[PDB]
C-alpha cells in the first residue's frame, strides 16, 4: 500500500539487512552438505518455531532497556556470561568472515583479465581429470576446471590440518585490504543500490542457471523432500545453527544495535519483514547454486548429490562455473564479486561497531573513550593476526571447523539459555507486560507458546540427540583427526562455559553467605534495570 516514497525507503533499508554472506555464501553449502530435500523442512521448522521468536526477543530485550549485549544483563546479573558468550561468538565470526572476504577480493582481482582462468583445463594447475565446459577418452574421476582453480591455484590445499605449509601471500594481501577497508569505514561511520544490486545480480545468474541442461536435476534434488534423513540430529543442528546465524541471533549485535532504536519502535514489524525476506533470499541464493549443480552433474557424469560435496568453497566452485557461461563473462564476474565484497564488509562493519561498543560499555568511561580509535585498531590488528592460519595451505580445514563448530549450534544453546532465563527466572508474565509497554499490544500467542514451551523443547532434544549421534566431521571425504574434532568442541563450548563461569564468579562476589538466598539475590533484577528517565510505568 502506497506511502509517498517515504516508507518504501524504510522497506529497502530493511531489505539490505536480510541479504548477506550468511545466505549468498553460507546457506547453499550447508544445504548441499545435508542434501537439499532433507534440509528444507528442518530449516523452515526451526526458523518458524525458534529463530523468528529469538530474533524478536533479542531485538525487544535490547530496545526496552537500551543497553548493549553485556549491560542488558541487568535483569539477572548472574547471567552476564550469556553476553560474554555472545562476544566469544562475535570474535570467532570476525576472524574467519574476513577470509571469506579474502577469497571474494581474490576472485574480484583475478577477474581483471581478458579470459577467466577457471574456464579451461589448458592451465598449469590443472590435472588430467579436468572435464572442461568449453574445451578420445581420458578419465574415470572427472573434475570441473573451477574445482581445480579453487583447490589447486587459489588455495594450494594440503592433505591435512597439520600441514600448514606456507601462507598464501596473495590471500594474505587481500586480508590486509579487507581489514583496512573495514577499519577505515569505522572512522567514516544511496540505499537503493545496496538493497537491490544483490537481487538483480542473483537474478542474472539465476536466469542463466535455469537455462542450462540438467538444471532441473539440481532443482529437483533441492526441492524434493527426503523424509528418510529426518532422524539425523546433525541435520536439525545445522538447520538450527543456520536459522539463528543468518538472523544474527547470539552474535549479540542485535541487542546492541536495538539499544540505539526508538523505545516505541515496532520491533515486531521489523522482525517479520527482515526474517521473511531473509528466508526468501536464502531459498533464492540456494536455488541458483542448485540449478548450477544440476549442470555440473551431467557435464561430469555423476549424481547431483556427489558433484561438489564441499563446505566453504561451494560458492567459489559453483558461482565461478556459471559466470563462464555468461556473455562478456569478466564484466559480470567483477560485478558479482564486488556484490559479495559489499555484502561481506557491511556485516563486518556492524559486527565490529558492536564488538567495540560493548567493550567500551564494560569499562571506566573517559580514558576508554579516548582509546576508541586505538581499541578499534587493536581489534583489526588482532583480527588480521588471528586470520593468518586461515590463509595457510591448511586454511579451509580450520575455516570449516570454526564455522561448523565455534559459530554453529553454540548460537542456539546461548539463546536458549536466555529464553529460559527471561521466561522462567525473570518471568514471562513480567516480560510480556514490558513488551506491551512499547508495542501497545502483547506478543502474538504464537511467540508466547514458542518462547515458553516449543523453543526449549525442540532445542533440548536436538542438543541431546546430537550428543548421542555425533560423527567425526568431514570436508569432502577428508575425515578430520581426533585432535581436530577435540579443538572443535573446545571452540564450541568456549562461548557456552562463559555462562556457568560468570555464575560462579557472581555467586562468590554477591551478598548472602547462605546456600540459596544468595542465588535469589543474584537472579532478581538490578535497581537500575528498566528504560531511561521518562519511560516508567513502574519506577
Amino acid at each position, epitope marked *: 500500500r502506497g506511502n509517498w516514497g517515504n516508507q518504501i525507503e524504510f522497506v529497502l533499508t530493511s531489505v539490505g539487512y536480510a541479504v548477506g554472506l550468511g545466505n549468498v555464501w553460507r546457506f547453499p553449502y550447508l544445504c548441499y552438505r545435508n542434501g537439499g530435500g532433507a534440509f528444507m523442512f528442518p530449516y523452515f521448522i526451526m526458523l518458524i518455531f525458534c529463530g523468528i521468536p529469538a530474533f524478536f526477543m533479542e531485538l525487544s530485550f535490547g530496545q526496552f532497556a537500551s543497553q548493549g549485549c553485556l549491560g542488558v544483563w541487568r535483569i539477572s546479573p548472574m547471567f552476564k556470561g550469556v553476553g560474554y558468550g555472545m562476544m566469544v561468538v562475535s570474535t570467532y565470526i570476525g576472524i574467519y568472515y574476513n577470509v571469506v572476504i579474502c577469497i571474494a577480493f581474490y576472485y574480484f582481482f583475478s577477474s581483471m583479465t581478458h*579470459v577467466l582462468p577457471w*574456464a579451461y583445463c589448458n592451465n598449469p594447475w590443472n590435472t588430467h581429470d579436468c572435464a572442461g565446459v568449453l574445451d578420445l577418452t581420458h578419465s574415470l574421476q572427472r573434475t570441473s576446471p573451477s574445482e581445480e582453480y579453487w583447490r589447486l591455484y587459489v588455495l594450494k590445499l594440503s592433505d591435512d590440518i597439520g600441514n600448514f605449509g606456507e601462507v598464501r601471500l596473495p590471500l594474505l594481501g587481500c586480508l590486509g585490504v579487507a581489514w583496512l577497508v573495514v577499519f577505515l569505514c569505522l572512522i567514516r561511520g544511496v540505499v537503493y543500490f545496496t538493497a537491490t544490486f544483490p537481487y538483480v545480480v542473483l537474478t542474472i545468474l539465476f536466469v542463466r542457471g535455469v*537455462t542450462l541442461e540438467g538444471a532441473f536435476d539440481g532443482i529437483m534434488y533441492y526441492l524434493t523432500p527426503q523424509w528418510d534423513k529426518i532422524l539425523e540430529a546433525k541435520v536439525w543442528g545445522d538447520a538450527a545453527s543456520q536459522a539463528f546465524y543468518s538472523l544474527g541471533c547470539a552474535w549479540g549485535g542485535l541487542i546492541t544495535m536495538a539499544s540505539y532504536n526508538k523505545f516505541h519502535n515496532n520491533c515486531y514489524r521489523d522482525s517479520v519483514i527482515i526474517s521473511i525476506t531473509n528466508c526468501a533470499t536464502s531459498v533464492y541464493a540456494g536455488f541458483v547454486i542448485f540449478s548450477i549443480l544440476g549442470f555440473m552433474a551431467n557435464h561430469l557424469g555423476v549424481d547431483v548429490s556427489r558433484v561438489a560435496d564441499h563446505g566453504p568453497g561451494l560458492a567459489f566452485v559453483a558461482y565461478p562455473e556459471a559466470l563462464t*557461461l555468461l556473455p*562478456i563473462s*569478466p564484466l559480470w564476474s567483477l560485478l558479482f564479486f564486488f556484490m559479495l565484497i559489499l555484502l561481506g564488509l557491511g556485516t563486518q562493519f556492524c559486527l565490529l561497531e558492536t564488538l567495540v561498543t560493548a567493550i567500551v560499555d564494560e569499562v571506566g568511561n573517559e580514558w576508554i573513550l579516548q582509546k576508541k580509535t586505538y581499541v578499534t585498531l587493536g581489534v583489526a590488528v588482532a583480527g588480521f593476526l588471528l586470520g593468518i592460519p586461515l590463509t595457510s595451505q591448511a586454511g579451509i580445514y580450520w575455516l570449516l571447523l570454526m564455522d561448523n563448530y565455534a559459530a554453529s549450534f553454540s548460537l542456539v544453546v546461548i539463546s536458549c539459555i536466555m529464553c529460559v532465563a527471561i521466561m522462567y527466572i525473570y518471568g514471562h508474565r513480567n516480560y510480556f507486560q514490558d513488551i506491551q509497554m512499547m508495542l501497545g499490544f502483547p506478543p502474538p500467542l504464537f511467540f508466547q507458546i514458542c518462547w515458553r514451551f516449543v523453543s526449549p523443547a525442540i532445542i533440548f532434544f536436538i542438543l541431546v540427540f546430537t550428543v548421542i549421534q555425533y560423527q567425526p566431521i568431514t570436508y569432502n571425504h577428508y575425515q578430520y583427526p581426533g585432535w581436530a574434532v577435540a579443538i572443535g568442541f573446545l571452540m564450541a563450548l568456549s562461548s557456552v562455559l562463559c555462562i556457568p563461569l560468570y555464575a560462579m564468579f557472581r555467586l562468590a562476589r554477591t551478598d548472602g553467605d547462605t546456600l540459596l538466598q544468595r542465588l535469589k539475590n543474584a537472579t532478581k533484577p538490578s535497581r537500575d534495570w528498566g528504560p531511561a528517565l521518562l519511560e516508567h510505568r513502574t519506577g
Partner: nanobody
Framework: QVQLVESGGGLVQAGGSLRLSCAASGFPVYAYEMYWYRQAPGKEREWVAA????????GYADSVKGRFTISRDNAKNTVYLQMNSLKPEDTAVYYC??????????????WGQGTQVTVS
C-alpha cells in the same frame, strides 16, 4: 576443431514445410546456446532464431514468430529449425551458428556451410 554442417534445404512451394538440421561437432555443444541466421539474395545476413542450452527459452525474429520452431537433441549434437507456412520472402541461404565467448570480453562466430531454401 569446431565444425557445423547443415542439411535439409532445397525447392519447396509456398505454404510448404521444411526441417533444417545442423550437425555440430568438435565441442561440448550442450553448454552452448545455438542460433540460426539467413542470408536472402541481395540482402545482409539476418537473424532468425536462438535456443537455450536445455531448450527452456527459445527466441525468434519478429518476422518468423509462430511460423518457425527451433529445437535441439543434445545427444545427437544437433539443433533444428522447423519451418512451416513458408512464404517466398523466406528464400535464403540458412546458416547455423554458435558464438563462443571463451570466458572473455568477445566472441568468435563459427558458421555452418549454409543450406539454400527456395520458396516458389
Amino acid at each position: 576443431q569446431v565444425q557445423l554442417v547443415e542439411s535439409g534445404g532445397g525447392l519447396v512451394q509456398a505454404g510448404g514445410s521444411l526441417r533444417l538440421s545442423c550437425a555440430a561437432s568438435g565441442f561440448p555443444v550442450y553448454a552452448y546456446e545455438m542460433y540460426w541466421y539467413r542470408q536472402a539474395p541481395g540482402k545482409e545476413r539476418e537473424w532468425v532464431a536462438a535456443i537455450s542450452s536445455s531448450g527452456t527459452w527459445a527466441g525468434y525474429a519478429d518476422s518468423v514468430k509462430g511460423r518457425f520452431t527451433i529445437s535441439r537433441d543434445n545427444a545427437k549434437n544437433t539443433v533444428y529449425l522447423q519451418m512451416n507456412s513458408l512464404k517466398p520472402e523466406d528464400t535464403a541461404v540458412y546458416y547455423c551458428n554458435v558464438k563462443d565467448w571463451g570466458a572473455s570480453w568477445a566472441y568468435y562466430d563459427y558458421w555452418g556451410q549454409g543450406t539454400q531454401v527456395t520458396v516458389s
